[PDB]
């Protein structure tokens, strides 16, 4: 869970993200796949070249799920249980990969909303994305 000053920065930054959700998703994944190409091993049949329709479509879903976490921020694990089964049991994504994606979303947010991306906002988002990542990750791995 997060604190008041944190939950409110999350909710408040989300308002800004929502109107550019599609491009934030796409950019987050392009940064990820180009900076840490080994993460592509989890998408063997996807075309993950920059600009691809498939990468773009996936980026929209990822940011939309972050939205689900923000909506049910008081109970993220509850809201993401199906996605959690998908990422833990089904796909067995190694925990390290979530850190790589989270960092790329922070990079994207910092470049997109420089004024709202204070050290304090950066801290609340790093913490929020760590909660999201733990939820999606196979416990104890």
């Amino acid at each position: 869970s997060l604190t008041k000053t944190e939950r409110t920065i999350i909710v408040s930054m989300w308002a800004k993200i929502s109107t550019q959700a599609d491009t934030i998703g796409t950019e987050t994944l392009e940064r990820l796949f180009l900076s840490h190409p080994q993460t592509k091993t989890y998408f063997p049949h996807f075309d993950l070249h920059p600009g691809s329709a498939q990468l773009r479509a996936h980026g929209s879903k990822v940011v939309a799920a972050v939205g689900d976490a923000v909506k049910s921020i008081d109970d993220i694990g509850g809201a993401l249980s199906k996605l959690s089964e998908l990422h833990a049991y089904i796909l067995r994504v190694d925990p390290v990969n979530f850190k790589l994606l989270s960092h790329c979303l922070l990079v994207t947010l910092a470049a997109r909303f420089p004024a709202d991306f204070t050290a304090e906002a950066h801290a609340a988002w790093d913490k929020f994305l760590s909660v999201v990542s733990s939820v999606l990750t196979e416990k104890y791995r």
Partner: protein, 145 residues
């Protein structure tokens, strides 16, 4: 290593970096985002709040030094280990810093470059800077023993 495109790109953007500000901004963020790192700079004073940290004159002056060390590495990509040997012994022998922390500072610096350059800090430019900050972290952890 870094390709002509990557090397030229990171060098060109580095020329536009405010050297009295970026370093302190990166060190400040590290202390705020990863609170535990405050323990290594207790002589710095009040770091009890995000504003305290970001306004701290000491956070900023030391940040300038860290920024300077990064500039040196950027000038010595092909010999980062030789370039950071002394700082590495210093961080291991005197400061006792878990080198896993170097990665955090690198990530935070990457966020600061994105924060300042916005659209110009594209995904391929970030991928180039990720190689540099990983290379510097590696070199700084190299003389640990």
């Amino acid at each position: 290593h870094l390709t002509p495109v990557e090397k030229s790109a990171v060098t060109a953007l580095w020329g536009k970096v405010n050297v009295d500000e970026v370093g302190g901004e990166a060190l400040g963020r590290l202390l705020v985002v990863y609170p535990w790192t405050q323990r290594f700079f207790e002589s710095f004073g009040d770091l009890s709040t995000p504003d305290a940290v970001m306004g701290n004159p000491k956070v900023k002056a030391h940040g300038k030094k860290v920024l300077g060390a990064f500039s040196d590495g950027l000038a010595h990509l092909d010999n980062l280990k030789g370039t950071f040997a002394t700082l590495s012994e210093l961080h291991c022998d005197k400061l006792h810093v878990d080198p896993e922390n170097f990665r955090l500072l690198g990530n935070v610096l990457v966020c600061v470059l994105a924060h300042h350059f916005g659209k110009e800090f594209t995904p391929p430019v970030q991928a180039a800077y990720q190689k540099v900050v990983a290379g510097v972290a590696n070199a700084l952890a190299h003389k640990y023993h």
